[PDB]
Design a protein around this ligand. Structure first.
Ligand SMILES: Nc1ncnc2c1ncn2[C@@H]1O[C@H](COP(=O)(O)OP(=O)(O)O)[C@@H](O)[C@H]1O
Ligand SMILES: [Mg+2]
Length: 383
């Protein structure tokens, strides 16, 4: 029946949503999850894995497990983001013959859109599995700061995935549509605070009712492309390494398998601490030595997590001030504050944002779902 999907093609994760009549519905993937890791593995035996199945095999296949491709897409190999990433990514980043930032996978040169297209194919299949019918139309989101090359390379990923890309929309504009900030009257200035797995974006968006149609303008954009939830995980991981050093003599940083388990356990404990006051990190058989297997069992309070990440939360505030100054505005000129991204579910982040703007952020949608939902709302406007 010709159905247009909304896709959040995120740095860390991806989300796919749809109009179910008048109501947006985020879809569950083949693994039962409403979010799919933006991770693509080319296995030794010839399979292409995407999402949590690729995440599981990553430490067995570091060369051919790709992730963070949103950092490369539409960029040149000499871009400062790309040069920073060359020495930290375990997969091989290369210059194309035209100077573009490409990847080499099992000896094959590939452009970033060919890799991101595997994420988009999974979002497409995820929609087809829920609907019981083909899906070939999409709205896809990008950061507001993306230039024509990054937008066009994102379009190219959709085309390679077999999607007719009806429209590339800004992420904070999609978030405004999901929060229903179009079902209003007059002028409306909004702050979109977006804290994902890898990036922090602040966008100030003006929204005028004029001539019966609603205008949308990005007045200012700021942030930090190296501030996200993975950095919050890293603070908890480093705490868990040092407590296990103190209590059992072992530096777990030597054991790269123990470290894959510890990262996973730190993220789970962080996420539990958004709704509980304390949790346990319990990893049986975490490592072993001459005296046999060791077991990690460490209580983590929410207050301990908050102390480990406070300066990361405080880094998000200076780009808010600069964004307001570039827009020519004060906190009182902001009518609505919306949160986007899974890391904004943390009570400390919500409270710091509410405190800075002097108003409680809206609650209409999940922060981690807003970009995909708004892409779907925009798709339904074109249906
Ligand atoms: N309830 C939660 N509490 C704290 N952090 C969370 C929670 N849910 C998800 N996160 C974190 O949010 C990040 C995912 O952000 P997300 O918006 O999905 O990424 P993307 O940048 O790809 O849009 C991860 O670091 C994840 O651990
Ligand atoms: Mg995001």
């Amino acid at each position: 029946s010709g159905k247009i999907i909304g896709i959040d093609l995120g740095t860390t994760n991806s989300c796919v949503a749809i109009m179910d009549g008048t109501t947006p519905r985020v879809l569950e993937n083949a693994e039962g999850d409403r979010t799919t890791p933006s991770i693509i593995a080319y296995t030794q035996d010839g399979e292409t894995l995407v999402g949590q199945p690729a995440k599981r095999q990553a430490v067995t296949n570091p060369q051919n497990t790709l992730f963070a491709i949103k950092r490369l897409i539409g960029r040149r190999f000499q871009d400062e983001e790309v040069q920073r990433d060359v020495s930290i990514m375990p997969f091989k980043i290369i210059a194309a013959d035209n100077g573009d930032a490409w990847v080499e996978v099992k000896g094959q040169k590939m452009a970033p859109p060919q890799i991101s297209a595997e994420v988009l194919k999974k979002m497409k299949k995820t929609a087809e599995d829920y609907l019981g019918e083909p899906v070939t139309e999409a709205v896809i989101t990008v950061p507001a700061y993306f230039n024509d090359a990054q937008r066009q390379a994102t379009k190219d990923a959709g085309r390679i995935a077999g999607l007719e890309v009806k429209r590339i929309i800004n992420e904070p504009t999609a978030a405004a549509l999901a929060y229903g900030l179009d079902k209003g009257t007059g002028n409306r200035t909004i702050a979109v605070y977006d804290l994902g797995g890898g990036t922090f974006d602040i966008s100030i968006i003006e929204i005028d009712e004029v001539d019966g149609e609603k205008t949308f303008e990005v007045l200012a954009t700021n942030g930090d492309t190296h501030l996200g939830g993975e950095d919050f995980d890293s603070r908890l991981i480093n705490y868990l390494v040092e407590e296990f050093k103190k209590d059992q003599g072992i530096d777990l940083r030597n054991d790269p398998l123990a470290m894959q388990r510890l990262k996973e356990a730190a993220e789970k404990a962080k996420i539990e601490l958004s709704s509980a006051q304390q949790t346990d990190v319990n990893l049986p058989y975490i490592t072993a030595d001459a005296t046999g297997p060791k077991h990690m069992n460490i209580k983590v309070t929410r207050a301990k997590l908050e102390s480990l990440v406070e300066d990361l939360v405080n880094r998000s505030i200076e780009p808010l001030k600069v964004a307001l100054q570039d827009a020519g505005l004060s906190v009182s000129d902001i009518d609505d504050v919306i949160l986007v991204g899974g890391q904004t579910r943390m009570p400390m982040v919500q409270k710091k944002v509410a405190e800075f703007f002097g108003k409680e952020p809206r609650k209409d949608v999940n922060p981690d779902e807003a970009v995909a939902i708004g892409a779907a709302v925009q798709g339904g406007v074109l249906t």
